[PDB]
Amino acid sequence: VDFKLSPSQLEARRHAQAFANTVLTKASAEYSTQKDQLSRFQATRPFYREAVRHGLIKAQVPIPLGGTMESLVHESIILEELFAVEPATSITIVATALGLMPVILCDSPSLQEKFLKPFISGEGEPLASLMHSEPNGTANWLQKGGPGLQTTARKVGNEWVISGEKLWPSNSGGWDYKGADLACVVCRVSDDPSKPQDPNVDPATQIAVLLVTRETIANNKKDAYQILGEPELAGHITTSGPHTRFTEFHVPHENLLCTPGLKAQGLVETAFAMSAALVGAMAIGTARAAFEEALVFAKSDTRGGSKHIIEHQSVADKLIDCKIRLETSRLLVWKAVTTLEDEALEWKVKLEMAMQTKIYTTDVAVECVIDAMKAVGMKSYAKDMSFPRLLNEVMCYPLFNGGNIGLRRRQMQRVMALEDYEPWAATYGSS
Amino acid sequence: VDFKLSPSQLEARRHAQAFANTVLTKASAEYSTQKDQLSRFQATRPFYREAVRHGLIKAQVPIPLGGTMESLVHESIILEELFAVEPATSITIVATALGLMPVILCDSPSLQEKFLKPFISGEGEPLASLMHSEPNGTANWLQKGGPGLQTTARKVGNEWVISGEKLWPSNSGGWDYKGADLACVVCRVSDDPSKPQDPNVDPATQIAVLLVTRETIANNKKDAYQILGEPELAGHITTSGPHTRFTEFHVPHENLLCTPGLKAQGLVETAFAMSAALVGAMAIGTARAAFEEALVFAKSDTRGGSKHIIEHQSVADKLIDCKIRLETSRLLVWKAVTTLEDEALEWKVKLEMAMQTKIYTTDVAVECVIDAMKAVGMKSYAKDMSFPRLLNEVMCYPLFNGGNIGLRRRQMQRVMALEDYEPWAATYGS
Amino acid sequence: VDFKLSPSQLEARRHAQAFANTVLTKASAEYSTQKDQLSRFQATRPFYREAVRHGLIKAQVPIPLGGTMESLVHESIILEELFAVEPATSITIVATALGLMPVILCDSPSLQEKFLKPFISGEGEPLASLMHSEPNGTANWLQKGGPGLQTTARKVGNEWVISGEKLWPSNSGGWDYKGADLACVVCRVSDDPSKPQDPNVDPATQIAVLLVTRETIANNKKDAYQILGEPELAGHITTSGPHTRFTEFHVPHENLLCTPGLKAQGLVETAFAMSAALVGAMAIGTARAAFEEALVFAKSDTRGGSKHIIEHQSVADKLIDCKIRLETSRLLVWKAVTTLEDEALEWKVKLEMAMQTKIYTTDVAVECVIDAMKAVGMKSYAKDMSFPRLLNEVMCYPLFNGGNIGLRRRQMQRVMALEDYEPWAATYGSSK
Amino acid sequence: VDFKLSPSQLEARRHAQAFANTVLTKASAEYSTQKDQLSRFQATRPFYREAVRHGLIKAQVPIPLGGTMESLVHESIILEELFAVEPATSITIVATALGLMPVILCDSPSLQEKFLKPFISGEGEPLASLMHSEPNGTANWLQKGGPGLQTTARKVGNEWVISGEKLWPSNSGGWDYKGADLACVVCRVSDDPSKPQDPNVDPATQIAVLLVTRETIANNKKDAYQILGEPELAGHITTSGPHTRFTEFHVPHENLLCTPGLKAQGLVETAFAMSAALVGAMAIGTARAAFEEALVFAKSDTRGGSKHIIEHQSVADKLIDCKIRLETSRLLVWKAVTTLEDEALEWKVKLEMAMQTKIYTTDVAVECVIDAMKAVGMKSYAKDMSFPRLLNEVMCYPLFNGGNIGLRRRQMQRVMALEDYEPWAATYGSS
Ligand SMILES: Cc1cc2nc3c(=O)[nH]c(=O)nc-3n(C[C@H](O)[C@H](O)[C@H](O)COP(=O)(O)OP(=O)(O)OC[C@H]3O[C@@H](n4cnc5c(N)ncnc54)[C@H](O)[C@@H]3O)c2cc1C
Ligand SMILES: Cc1cc2nc3c(=O)[nH]c(=O)nc-3n(C[C@H](O)[C@H](O)[C@H](O)COP(=O)(O)OP(=O)(O)OC[C@H]3O[C@@H](n4cnc5c(N)ncnc54)[C@H](O)[C@@H]3O)c2cc1C
Ligand SMILES: Cc1cc2nc3c(=O)[nH]c(=O)nc-3n(C[C@H](O)[C@H](O)[C@H](O)COP(=O)(O)OP(=O)(O)OC[C@H]3O[C@@H](n4cnc5c(N)ncnc54)[C@H](O)[C@@H]3O)c2cc1C
Ligand SMILES: Cc1cc2nc3c(=O)[nH]c(=O)nc-3n(C[C@H](O)[C@H](O)[C@H](O)COP(=O)(O)OP(=O)(O)OC[C@H]3O[C@@H](n4cnc5c(N)ncnc54)[C@H](O)[C@@H]3O)c2cc1C
Ligand SMILES: CCCCCC[N+](=O)[O-]
Ligand SMILES: CCCCCC[N+](=O)[O-]
Ligand SMILES: CCCCCC[N+](=O)[O-]
Ligand SMILES: CCCCCC[N+](=O)[O-]
């Protein structure tokens, strides 16, 4: 057991820090002048171009697939540094990563070569999006006897036809609402969308993922793909994750990611279990920013007293609790990603580790930001400090990438209920 | 022991609700348009105008002083209902209340008559402000051996001369940066405004409060009263609480609220204890709004499943936590204001109850909002729901009106450490 | 609205303290020497005797029914004072109160006169028990399609025959395992106990409460009522709440408390709702003792430093947190009992308030005790301070009288899910 | 970065498990009949004997010093397994380990050879004790202007004389009240113990450690070493940590561990930093036992309903919180002990990490047991389940080995306040 970083991990840290400090710090000057979410998102396009120029999108794709990702620990380090400075553009990078995951994870070299090509070129500003979430919600998307996903698909000739709505998937409409360069659209198979999901079939058997490109959208009637709105978010105010409607939207059969059913469901589950672990690094970067701002302040400011406020035990208690939350969170993320990379472990073990990580790191990042604000005091409430941004940004984490209450805890609960659940398998090995 | 509300308390609640629903809900359409904190505050002026017309400023003044305040429980009920709908203007009302308190609490009939007059007229949009807070902080303003307050006053003939800076006090600059109608400026007495506070004197013995009106400002040089900046706040984005600088600012001795010393300090302490308890009503309003929005959602939305989400035990657990926080908070605020009204209790007993109340209610209001968001899920994060606004608004409460960490817990700790501390005197008697 | 105590409420507090300080403080010297739960229980008999002689058992019974209970607030004050000193015997008094409740609450004077008689005499050491809990659990007793209570009853002739097992009900076996003076035994009506509960019938419609006394037990075959064991508890080590087996136990029809069904469930729900609120006073007593010991310690010990430890912010923060939990807890108990006493409010409003009260006060008392220990430090861990006892005692509260997780949270949840739920009805009135 | 266990790490776990299961499980039947703390401790003597025979005492001493300790990760794994089953005797082993540490850590091979000798032999039942704690408290022992330690020492001719009282240090009086085989007695140097400590002297400059064996005690008058009493503990009821008075107690100058002053305080601080980190593993073992007992119950009891209790979301949520607390704890412990072993890192980096570890692991192990009990419900309150013992055992951890409130948080606070504090040095290296 070993925690030391290799020279390439230290170089990824250095490179990510440099990118964030030299490039991302310029973003706010551009996006703050914009009056709405899409406009703010479009204001970040030049920084995502710089990201691409700096190899950061290429770094979202494994080396065997033509990318430059070295490991999930490198990835975790990169995200913590990026989110420690500015989530604008950083969010777009990870949303693209998630949207590429179902293709990265499929077992089909031919499909991969085709769809990953623009993401590993080091050119343009290509966007990917995993379109799962819906207006009616998704916590119950696999509930037997439930309505299931409201975005359905049916085969017609050599085409699939998508009917439904999505909401929240980052990058989905692209820079311009003519679509992401690659969207993985998660659908429930249904020959008659007017009829309810069959209460006697396991919903996981009915899942299909259909790949939708800008060409796909161009090849459809104007009204078949419609952006109906763009949520104005509390924080991450420069991301795009619009409300999209598909009406009789046609997709070629060659764009079906895999055979509909458990294999499709498994690809979605895997993709979101990878993101469950990595989202902890985003949570850590945000909360670390809050902790470091409070820390510097408490060591430099006496608040009209005789001593720096760090000398007050109550103030120090808050900073201590922040520090501990950040340390345990990082350790858990690194354990989780290495667990996911471990070929000798059952999926069950990986999934449970990734759920734990998502739940802990995202819940605890909120407490960390709030305790930092309490330690700094009134000054933390005004916009000449980072806290107002941080408080809004950090509250996204427990809710997003599958919220902790409806989704992650339920996924973890199912694994623990299994007769062959081995709580410590990721640590002490299996029996 | 009784929890029953009287006809006039129930009518105060109805009147507050109707005012918030018919008047306050209209404010957002006006202030949302504006580009900066000050402009948003100014867009709010017609609504404060209506608040005066509805008697809500009079209601901040006790009846023996010519106002219409009926009791602190009536007050608590009004604030809860106002903040459950819209803190814009509501905030301006409570800041005025606070700015009036040192005058209300002093026992000088001629000062009360002269300075409370606009606030009991029912006319105009008069503002008050208690100007205590400073750029450098105030948690340590009474630390023996510390620098103390950085706004100082010295007597020069029949006048006092103010040198220094205030930051945060609501309404202080008025609507137009020519000043609030009444400002109570809290100062440290210093003959030499540049020599450090004497490490050998108890800081409480050096406090003075000077009353400053738009007339006082108009009677000084332009450069003696400078507004240097206006914080852009996370929430309560329509309030004003500027950075003010006083340079050789002259105030008549007749505008000295009381004898400098323990008495001036006691007046500030008493004002901030009353606000300590009443800010709990604010936190309850904001947190209640969150809870009720989450509850209605949980009972009417299945989130793509077969049952309303209130049926999921993890969801119900959050709402149960929210409800308990609110219920215990309102009980504590009513106990505190009642304790404050009791002529039989000693000050320390009242102070300590007021401190517990500010600490508890403001800390748990935050948890209540956040748990309400977690229950609603991803939808709570977008501005078509109330929560983004509520989240920012709620975080103000543990930090403001004397932050819990630096101020209220230390006030409470001092009381607990006194030799004659009786933890249960407000309940079982002294 | 008003928080002022009356001369009678102040006297009630004075009396409870006097009894705790002069009588209950002596109990330890007697029970500490005993080897097992039952023996420890028996060693408290003389103390329960004094409590009866002080009127404390008579005080568990409403005035209209021949007792001396003045109100639920009086009761709340008394319980807090008793538990702040010694839960031995105090626990027996409240367990009796619970056992009396289904009778107190039934609408039948003739029944009440007969069964409450010994409890209001001011003599002897009569014990009551409400026997609901079972070895297999009760969180799901009203789950439709579930097994239901495993203690069943059937009418044979003009008697009822009880089959099954109870576990946990305080005082149930009496002082000598020949039975409590009054036991209210909650059963599920079944004509064939070998057949499972009908999954199509609402469990609440099958509930029956049978009154069993020492005579009822003496009139049955010796093997019809067997005590099988007595749990060794972490804290409250002087109570008795044994494991009881009923086998073809015969009870006279005149001992059926009311018509079986929703009415019988309603009496049980009402009794446990009342205790749910009053059990907060117990939690408060235990946690108050933790708090005051820590506080006096912090104000008189410098732990080798120059200043009393109360002057350290982290220590103060703990005592502040304790104080706040106790203050909010008592306010909620008084609001909840006062709510339950209000004739104008719907049951669901009273129930919901009682559930919140049980949940909040019991959870936060645990925190209060643990924080008081952290503030005092290593010294809190040794038996020359009260904390080791307070620690084990306080952990009882979130688990007992209907656990927060399986019972109280679920009862509250059901009320919140109802179409006509009014969150603030107890504070601001109904819109109905 | 790597979390894999080596074959020797796995054998250590297996061995520790076998020992706890075949040996320590039998201790209860023996100590449960005894009527006081000292007799309960004495009733565990045959079990410590087996422990020595199994090599567990030898395993407390680094190999370079003649012991078998392979690493601090091995040690953490051993302690976790032992305390998951039975803290009787396990606690004695650990107390001995702390007692040995000032010698292990000093730079005197001659002292090390002489005094470690019994502990590396594999025979008898030798006990060590680090005697720091006192009747009047120790959280303020280094406060300038404060009374300081109330156990003082002075040099008289070629001997040191000890005046004062100790309370709590485990094993301090040995099996029979004639003394531990080795006690490191921590003293404040005072020539005239009637005088107050000089408020102008830095207290750390006055610390001395005197080694005291059964020999030293035998060579002194009986009245000069008196056991005044033995605390009756809430949990860990089979340990001894008596109240002892030294009156004119004579010690040969050869038994002086090192130069009094900062060197001596340094040794005490290092020994207590190591234990701070390792006490985490004890708290994990205890909390794990609670979690596992609750899990098994939850997956096999319906509590009179139709489904196992784990299917209830509120029960699962408690179990989930327990697991995350345990998982984050072990991670922090392993990170701390490896940080402590890193020769490249400055001491304050190691100290801050050790403090983090002790505070977090001990506070959350308490929450874990109580959540476990709440999940199981009323059944958890009776002694036919483990929870009553575990609840009492777990409450020791936040209070002992330097309590979080008075000691570990202030130690961490002081480091954080340093002008050159580097929060992430143990992770991302020092600048
Ligand atoms: C910046 C941002 C980026 C995003 N990125 C993407 C993306 O790339 N792709 C994508 O598809 N989506 C994305 N989302 C959406 C995100 O993944 C959400 O987590 C997702 O919509 C699910 O939300 P939810 O967990 O609240 O579930 P919902 O289904 O909306 O349920 C909401 C709440 O209901 C309750 N609930 C419902 N069912 C249960 C149950 N069975 N048990 C207990 N409680 C229940 C819970 O309290 C839950 O929190 C993004 C959102 C944001 C804001
Ligand atoms: C909308 C709004 C309205 C307001 N209204 C008014 C008003 O009408 N009048 C007015 O005067 N002010 C007003 N304020 C300011 C408000 O009252 C603040 O609470 C006040 O400025 C004091 O801030 P503080 O508690 O953070 O103390 P600071 O002195 O700013 O201290 C900041 C932090 O330092 C730490 N600290 C400092 N000293 C200690 C110590 N001794 N012990 C432990 N920790 C310490 C604490 O963590 C504390 O939170 C308003 C602010 C806002 C945003
Ligand atoms: C089973 C067991 C084994 C033990 N092993 C040993 C051993 O081997 N060797 C040994 O020497 N001791 C041992 N101890 C004692 C243990 O290490 C205690 O932690 C130690 O006695 C110090 O206790 P304390 O942290 O509570 O400090 P104390 O000095 O007792 O202070 C108690 C409380 O006062 C408050 N306080 C005091 N000063 C401050 C401050 N300046 N700032 C904030 N708060 C303050 C804190 O709340 C603190 O918790 C053992 C005890 C037990 C029960
Ligand atoms: C001192 C003492 C006095 C007592 N007094 C009496 C008395 O006088 N009369 C009497 O009858 N009993 C009494 N009891 C028992 C007490 O009332 C218990 O609370 C009762 O046995 C119910 O226990 P439980 O809540 O743990 O439920 P259980 O049925 O034992 O359930 C245990 C756990 O399972 C889980 N669970 C089960 N079902 C669900 C569900 N549907 N949803 C979510 N979680 C679930 C919960 O985590 C719950 O805590 C006493 C016990 C003690 C120790
Ligand atoms: C790695 C995370 C992708 C951005 C957010 C995805 N999501 O919310 O599901
Ligand atoms: C009663 C509330 C007054 C408004 C805020 C005052 N303050 O923050 O100090
Ligand atoms: C009012 C208290 C009764 C004693 C305990 C009863 N119970 O746990 O159910
Ligand atoms: C690692 C040693 C723990 C046993 C005693 C700890 N202590 O309290 O100092």
mmCIF file of N, CA and C in Angstrom, chain D residues 18-52:
data_model
loop_
_atom_site.group_PDB
_atom_site.id
_atom_site.type_symbol
_atom_site.label_atom_id
_atom_site.label_comp_id
_atom_site.label_asym_id
_atom_site.label_seq_id
_atom_site.Cartn_x
_atom_site.Cartn_y
_atom_site.Cartn_z
ATOM 1 N N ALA D 18 -7.046 -15.379 13.574
ATOM 2 C CA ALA D 18 -6.984 -16.703 14.214
ATOM 3 C C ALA D 18 -6.765 -16.558 15.709
ATOM 4 N N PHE D 19 -5.829 -15.697 16.082
ATOM 5 C CA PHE D 19 -5.595 -15.396 17.493
ATOM 6 C C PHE D 19 -6.830 -14.865 18.215
ATOM 7 N N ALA D 20 -7.434 -13.812 17.681
ATOM 8 C CA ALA D 20 -8.642 -13.286 18.312
ATOM 9 C C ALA D 20 -9.756 -14.351 18.442
ATOM 10 N N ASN D 21 -9.886 -15.204 17.425
ATOM 11 C CA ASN D 21 -11.017 -16.151 17.371
ATOM 12 C C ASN D 21 -10.815 -17.407 18.231
ATOM 13 N N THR D 22 -9.596 -17.928 18.266
ATOM 14 C CA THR D 22 -9.307 -19.109 19.082
ATOM 15 C C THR D 22 -8.940 -18.761 20.534
ATOM 16 N N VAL D 23 -8.281 -17.626 20.740
ATOM 17 C CA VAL D 23 -7.800 -17.247 22.063
ATOM 18 C C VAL D 23 -8.706 -16.238 22.802
ATOM 19 N N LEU D 24 -8.805 -15.020 22.263
ATOM 20 C CA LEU D 24 -9.489 -13.914 22.936
ATOM 21 C C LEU D 24 -10.974 -14.130 23.201
ATOM 22 N N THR D 25 -11.649 -14.888 22.336
ATOM 23 C CA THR D 25 -13.048 -15.252 22.572
ATOM 24 C C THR D 25 -13.257 -15.976 23.899
ATOM 25 N N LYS D 26 -12.226 -16.652 24.406
ATOM 26 C CA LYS D 26 -12.317 -17.367 25.690
ATOM 27 C C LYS D 26 -12.153 -16.471 26.927
ATOM 28 N N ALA D 27 -11.686 -15.232 26.748
ATOM 29 C CA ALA D 27 -11.345 -14.351 27.896
ATOM 30 C C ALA D 27 -12.547 -13.964 28.773
ATOM 31 N N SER D 28 -13.657 -13.661 28.118
ATOM 32 C CA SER D 28 -14.914 -13.294 28.756
ATOM 33 C C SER D 28 -15.321 -14.235 29.891
ATOM 34 N N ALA D 29 -15.274 -15.545 29.613
ATOM 35 C CA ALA D 29 -15.693 -16.603 30.565
ATOM 36 C C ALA D 29 -14.887 -16.529 31.844
ATOM 37 N N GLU D 30 -13.661 -16.020 31.707
ATOM 38 C CA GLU D 30 -12.737 -15.794 32.816
ATOM 39 C C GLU D 30 -12.891 -14.455 33.536
ATOM 40 N N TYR D 31 -12.918 -13.337 32.802
ATOM 41 C CA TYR D 31 -12.931 -12.019 33.468
ATOM 42 C C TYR D 31 -14.293 -11.589 33.977
ATOM 43 N N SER D 32 -15.352 -12.131 33.372
ATOM 44 C CA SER D 32 -16.739 -11.775 33.722
ATOM 45 C C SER D 32 -17.142 -12.160 35.150
ATOM 46 N N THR D 33 -16.384 -13.055 35.773
ATOM 47 C CA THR D 33 -16.698 -13.522 37.128
ATOM 48 C C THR D 33 -16.057 -12.640 38.203
ATOM 49 N N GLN D 34 -15.055 -11.857 37.809
ATOM 50 C CA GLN D 34 -14.322 -10.995 38.737
ATOM 51 C C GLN D 34 -15.125 -9.774 39.153
ATOM 52 N N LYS D 35 -14.890 -9.282 40.365
ATOM 53 C CA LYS D 35 -15.743 -8.221 40.944
ATOM 54 C C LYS D 35 -15.157 -6.804 40.926
ATOM 55 N N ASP D 36 -13.955 -6.629 40.378
ATOM 56 C CA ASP D 36 -13.404 -5.277 40.249
ATOM 57 C C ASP D 36 -12.445 -5.154 39.080
ATOM 58 N N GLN D 37 -12.085 -3.919 38.731
ATOM 59 C CA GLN D 37 -11.263 -3.670 37.559
ATOM 60 C C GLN D 37 -9.915 -4.432 37.610
ATOM 61 N N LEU D 38 -9.210 -4.341 38.739
ATOM 62 C CA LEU D 38 -7.912 -5.011 38.877
ATOM 63 C C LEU D 38 -8.021 -6.526 38.712
ATOM 64 N N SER D 39 -9.035 -7.144 39.323
ATOM 65 C CA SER D 39 -9.181 -8.596 39.203
ATOM 66 C C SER D 39 -9.514 -8.992 37.781
ATOM 67 N N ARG D 40 -10.181 -8.098 37.063
ATOM 68 C CA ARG D 40 -10.589 -8.426 35.690
ATOM 69 C C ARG D 40 -9.342 -8.408 34.823
ATOM 70 N N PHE D 41 -8.499 -7.413 35.070
ATOM 71 C CA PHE D 41 -7.214 -7.304 34.416
ATOM 72 C C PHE D 41 -6.375 -8.541 34.693
ATOM 73 N N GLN D 42 -6.282 -8.940 35.959
ATOM 74 C CA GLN D 42 -5.481 -10.125 36.310
ATOM 75 C C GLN D 42 -6.014 -11.385 35.637
ATOM 76 N N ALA D 43 -7.343 -11.481 35.507
ATOM 77 C CA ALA D 43 -7.967 -12.627 34.826
ATOM 78 C C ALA D 43 -7.613 -12.703 33.349
ATOM 79 N N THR D 44 -7.123 -11.610 32.766
ATOM 80 C CA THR D 44 -6.663 -11.653 31.364
ATOM 81 C C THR D 44 -5.192 -12.054 31.193
ATOM 82 N N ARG D 45 -4.452 -12.191 32.297
ATOM 83 C CA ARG D 45 -3.023 -12.605 32.216
ATOM 84 C C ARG D 45 -2.728 -13.847 31.335
ATOM 85 N N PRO D 46 -3.495 -14.950 31.503
ATOM 86 C CA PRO D 46 -3.246 -16.082 30.608
ATOM 87 C C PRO D 46 -3.411 -15.755 29.118
ATOM 88 N N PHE D 47 -4.100 -14.660 28.788
ATOM 89 C CA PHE D 47 -4.392 -14.348 27.376
ATOM 90 C C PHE D 47 -3.289 -13.503 26.736
ATOM 91 N N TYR D 48 -2.748 -12.574 27.518
ATOM 92 C CA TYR D 48 -1.538 -11.829 27.169
ATOM 93 C C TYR D 48 -0.345 -12.777 27.004
ATOM 94 N N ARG D 49 -0.259 -13.783 27.875
ATOM 95 C CA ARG D 49 0.743 -14.862 27.758
ATOM 96 C C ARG D 49 0.697 -15.547 26.390
ATOM 97 N N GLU D 50 -0.505 -15.939 25.956
ATOM 98 C CA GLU D 50 -0.702 -16.500 24.608
ATOM 99 C C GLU D 50 -0.314 -15.508 23.548
ATOM 100 N N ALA D 51 -0.682 -14.244 23.746
ATOM 101 C CA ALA D 51 -0.322 -13.191 22.812
ATOM 102 C C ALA D 51 1.187 -13.121 22.607
ATOM 103 N N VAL D 52 1.935 -13.089 23.707
ATOM 104 C CA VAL D 52 3.409 -13.138 23.663
ATOM 105 C C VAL D 52 3.880 -14.380 22.912
#
